[model samples]
Target: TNANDLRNNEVFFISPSNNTNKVLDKISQSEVKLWNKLSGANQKWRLIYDTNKQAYKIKVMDNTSLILTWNAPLSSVSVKTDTNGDNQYWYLLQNYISRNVIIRNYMNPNLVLQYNIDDTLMVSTQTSSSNQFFKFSNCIYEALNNRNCKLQTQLNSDRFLSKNLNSQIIVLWQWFDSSRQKWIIEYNETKSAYTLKCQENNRYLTWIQNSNNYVETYQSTDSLIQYWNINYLDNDASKYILYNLQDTNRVLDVYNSQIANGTHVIVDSYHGNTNQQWIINLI
Candidate 1:
């Protein structure tokens, strides 16, 4: 079946579900391999959807498939050559339950493509091994389409960032898990920032600088107030702090260290408190 909105998505970190600790990288012209996590620019690729074949081709930006000259196996070409070739065509067969996908060969439908143990591609027969499926990482649209994604206080792990309107003049509160606590955390590529959209109100979690700033959400404007530079304090990038792009020094907070019902979510200078650190929980 179709791979949904991924054709429009920009991330290229194809991580194997069996071993998500590694990322796939196609450094050589036609050879692909695996790299450790903490990967960056060198380990990137973009998916090009073929309309006629109804499949996809893994390629890179600028269509720059030809770089090396005299001694290299590279010519002035791209992943675009032999455009309608069978070997280049791959049908994305996805597991609806696990959300993992298998790149089945279009020319040889019985075989599926997979990454070897830090080596070349393995076009082998379909097996029960999770190695055959690679999950497209960091797609916020996936979390938004499928619910149960929320943020929690890292220190206590019980309280969550919630939006409540019972008192009417609302602020994000340290509340229990429910519909009001779920959030759609989307990354803005242009600004290199993130937008925390409250599923309860469809507004963005926004903050501005003040001696004691209040963290709240309203009708999202294209202004800097809605943009947050979320930084992970953990080495593996798990527990993170939400700092405003407007003022990098300040961060999200829970007032008076009170992890109780209706405790206000505010903004203050970073002291790295449990209230200042939040963990994203994906369901």
Candidate 2:
């Protein structure tokens, strides 16, 4: 796979041995390891295309400030602050045997990212083996651009962005792993925004018409009101600010900052409060 084939900011899991499990994960103290898939921020990563370097920079979605750092004698692909060096750039090459992609070091052609027997994240000499194959997937089997995610209220981890049953209105409800809470983010280039689709009823999260500023799901028309500008709050990728694309001044907010079972949700002026903050994770 070439760099053009990979989407920038496409959240994915890098699995060793091509298929599943034993994903490359980010750990504390700027360390990396191979571990069982947890689907947490540590296990989630995004491939950012760098035009200047003509390679991709693998970044931890939790704290994007961290990049996959490469050091040969260390025997593993570690983590460190991105200094825009050659060691930080990577190339994805097609693997014929497994039909997956081989993550290669751009600076060192012979070195390829690998998973160790003891779960160490390393870069080994380029060779044909199952250990060299890495699969990049975003938890779903559909389109590469689509991302399956869960939007949880930052203030209350238990509360999730859920579709109100029997109503089009959206509310903050407790987490139950229900389909009503599953949100799919699809980006649109025309507007440079994203449309949040509810997996429960296949509806787009919309800015309700004929109303003040309520948020709800409606049939996909690809309208500007249905589009949102999702960005990190305060340079923290773990927390997001869901702003309305049409109404730039407002954002998705929990009414009254309530944590009730079915608290109403609406688009209000952004105050940078916890109620307006959200934690989005690939589910």
Candidate 3:
């Protein structure tokens, strides 16, 4: 991966060679081990690269202050508050095979982070084995400015939520960077909810009471229909369900569970399906 890709403030799942399905997870400040991927904050890590040191400070999304640290003698790995210590810095050495990378300690170049046969995380001496090679995937980058953003379907990366032209209806379409595809997420302190305003028409996502009971972008009046609760899935903040305030049981959904582009977007009872899940990324 390029330096830009590694420094995007995106969450990644670290899969060791022992089992690609299992990822290194932080269960507590002093405990780290391999677990099946659940997309939880404990399993998500952000790599912040230090150009001067040519290493990265691996941090967990749940606690930005806590970073992965290597303990000596026992060779155990755990999370600890950042102290600008060399033990917290890790070098990402690319493996000869494909996109796999080896995580080495900045203080001890000979030791690399890996999982033991018992599924325990530890820093062991560098060796010619798959145990030292780790694969990185599932990148979820949050918005930068923290204001305007876009909602992309995790089910389909090419599809984005957009407002229909001269209409109140919203639909899924191929992303074009148009105003309809841009949204301003504003939090309402009182309701503990969010209001998504369309940048194109200066409207908010509203639940209209009509024949189709469609969810559309309409004039903002701070109505309950315009408010939405973000319910994160698997404790992963980036993936969530946009629950309609007007009807708590309903959510922003793709019409008829379709995946095709130009599919109409509507409000439907929450089914906890992939079609109802979305990723809110900064523009």
Candidate 4:
């Protein structure tokens, strides 16, 4: 039989090798666990392998597609189509290109949450109450030109120096040196609310507001508090950093702390800690 024929079909085959004993062993040892693991999972696609042609394929929404047609070592073929390594993986690609998570949420076919905005707070559609309307103040988009062309720093490094959207968070602190072509942004993901060591002498600043608009602050290098709270701007793709308003001295301490940790960092005023103090590179 032609190997390519297995591209998009539902066919089962048994290996010619005498491995019935091995099959039973695996069925009892791991097949049960695998079956149970897959039982509760909601997978978007199904994988099928054909022993005849040694072909592997995927089925999405009942539509089958050819993933591979050659019968090579599973390890070798898996490496080629693994989609897991930094070079050949989707997750690594997403992180390297710096796609926004919130945008992903908005664009996902299986997105479970909807976004709504009222005043400064952005709310998730699933959350019917006002509490879901997260306050994201001081939202700043790259300034646009005369034609309203949004201007972002072309120096890839200057564009929200977050390496990944999942863990590391960024904070946009007002306009520090708009003339210098650099806005004061900070990092609150790794350390505390203290100014992130962005560059040589520059430090990213932050606003002091909560996900709900309350203001709070944290002392520089507060080991006790490693992370600042955050609330996704459910309204728009834009996200905000959460900060505390009550911490006045810590707020003032921002002026003195100047060091870029990850990349571009600077100083600015405090709003709160929500969109005010901490920022996440979702996209």
RMSD of each: 12.5, 6.1, 13.5, 23.3
Clashes of 1: 0
Candidate 2: the clashing residue pairs are: none
> How would you encode candidate 2's per-residue C-alpha lDDT over 245-264 as one tens digit per residue?
87878899998899998898
The total number of steric clashes, by the backbone 3 Å criterion, in model 2 comes to 0
Steric overlap count per candidate: 0, 0, 1, 41
TM-score against truth, every candidate: 0.49, 0.62, 0.53, 0.19
Q: List the residue pairs that clash in candidate 1.
A: none
- Model 3 Cα lDDT, one tens digit per residue, 1-283: 2311344344578887656678888877668888987767888887788999999998886744578998765688899888888999999877454677889999888889977887788899988888788887643322222378888877798889999877778989888899999998876655656788899998998888666767788886767988886545533456768889888899988887777877888888988788889987778
Query: Predicted candidate 1: what Cα RMSD to the true structure?
Result: 12.5
Rank by TM-score, highest first: 2, 3, 1, 4
lDDT of candidate model 1 versus the reference:
0.62
What is the RMSD, in Å, between candidate 3 and the native fold over all Cα?
13.5
Best by TM-score: 2
- Model 3 alpha-carbon drift over 4 Å, by segment: 1-5, 141-164, 167-236, 239-283
Per-residue error (Å), model 1, residue 53: 47
Task: Flag regions of model 2 displaced more than 4 Å.
Answer: 1-5, 61-65, 72-75, 94-99, 139-152, 155-203, 208-214, 220-276, 279-283
**Which stretches of model 1 miss by more than 4 angstroms?**
1-148, 167-177, 208-211, 234-236
Q: Looking at candidate 1, what is the lDDT of residue 79?
A: 34
lDDT of each: 0.62, 0.78, 0.78, 0.24
